[PDB]
């Protein structure tokens, strides 16, 4: 509950998404950062019997950046909770990886954190 | 390619998934560890045209620890690439968040790194 | 330059540091949550000859979390970077490790993000 | 105790490290990958009396990319612990920040993980 909708980080970027009754989320998602250009798939899942004791939901999903506008060959995920309330927020920490040879494989996979709110910065 | 089917990592957990032609996945998760219990759902994407210069297939998936037998009000997302050949691998990272109020949203994160093969350590 | 001194992230934590000549961080760190009391030691390292384009400046610290009060069988690394200005920052990123058996290793790992600024919150 | 000395990782960088008496690391690193050459001076923290249950000894420490030869305008951070024992390890999970513009930031800090072991691969 609460989590369908759209969604707005603090680069801008735009997360469109479905929660599903049985736990589910589908929607799309476009980048305001990197290489990326337009909407991509996301899926995903989350907590759809969460604790009733303040704390937030646990979800993430997944985008690979792939479209027929652009291929960055690589993937992120975002995994994190949704926190409800007047200022309600999806707050995360994420991991991109980008296909790499064996020789640039420890180099693969950037690490950040957005912040999502329903009203954009 | 190469994707579909069960892949095993260090800890003796089971993934099974099957890589649809545009680029989405879908299975099922058994964890070896942790607060977990028979199979759960999971969803993620991977890049269905990845490069062709020894690169692996950037690729993602989430499960949330919620079945009919346990939750665990959390979700872990996987962050990796699969590299094919004799040996195939999924080499991850991944990102496990729990509910948590705002006192404890601090530590509401864990981080690891998973390391799947097609026969069992 | 323009790292000495002391810094404040958005739980309220302390950060006192000394960054010397040749690239030395030495100083104390007071946190405001979890299972802290008190200074504790640090010490890390920081380029100190950074790039002149705009872009920030790279450091990182340790605190291992014992000192005369307590101790909580963990460290904490954070990496990031410095950014100066009219409201300069320190942006991190951090891993903190607890000492575990084999069995709970997987588990043994948070991660988070901290802001730290020249006035507090 | 047991931390003292030279360590090797899968990439085949050497750790050389003093453990002192009251929890500091100092010494140097020199990597296999990317952009390195020769050593570089590093410092950290270690828990100086953990726990005696069989658990590890928790530890990290930091290195800036910068020496006499070369100046890659990063840090990373190392997270772990020493495991004792005939097979004794370092298991860590690092973060390496790059010095990043504005526009670059949330590109700005890779993660990995690497396994150190007293008799190299
Ligand atoms: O830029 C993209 C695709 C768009 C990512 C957008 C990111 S998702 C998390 C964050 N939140 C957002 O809303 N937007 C940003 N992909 C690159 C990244 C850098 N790449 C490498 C290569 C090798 N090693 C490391 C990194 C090459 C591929
Ligand atoms: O144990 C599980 C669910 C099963 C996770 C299994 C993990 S997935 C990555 C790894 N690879 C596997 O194959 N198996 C393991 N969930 C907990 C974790 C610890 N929890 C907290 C709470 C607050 N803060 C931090 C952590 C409470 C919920
Ligand atoms: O609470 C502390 C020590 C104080 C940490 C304070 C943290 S540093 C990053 C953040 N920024 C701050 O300013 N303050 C916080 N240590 C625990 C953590 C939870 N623990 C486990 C055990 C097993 N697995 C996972 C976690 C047990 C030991
Ligand atoms: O290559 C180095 C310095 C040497 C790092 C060696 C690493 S330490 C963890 C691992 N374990 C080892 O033993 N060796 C490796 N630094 C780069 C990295 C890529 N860079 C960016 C820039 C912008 N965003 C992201 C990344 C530019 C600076």
Request: no cysteine; proline share 2%.
């Given at each position: ?30 980048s ?5 250009e ?12 969460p604790?009733?004791?303040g ?67």
């Amino acid at each position: 509950a609460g989590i369908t909708g759209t969604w707005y980080n603090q680069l801008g970027s735009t997360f469109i998404v479905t929660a599903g009754a049985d736990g589910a989320l589908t929607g799309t998602y476009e980048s305001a950062a990197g290489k990326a250009e337009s909407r991509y798939v996301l899926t995903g899942r989350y907590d759809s019997a969460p604790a009733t004791d303040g704390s937030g939901t646990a979800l993430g999903w997944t985008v690979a950046w792939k479209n027929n506008y652009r291929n960055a060959h690589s993937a992120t995920t975002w995994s994190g909770q949704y926190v409800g309330g007047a200022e309600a927020r999806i707050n995360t920490q994420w991991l991109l990886t980008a296909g790499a040879t064996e020789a640039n494989g420890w180099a693969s996979t950037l690490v950040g954190h957005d912040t999502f709110t329903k009203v954009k910065p």
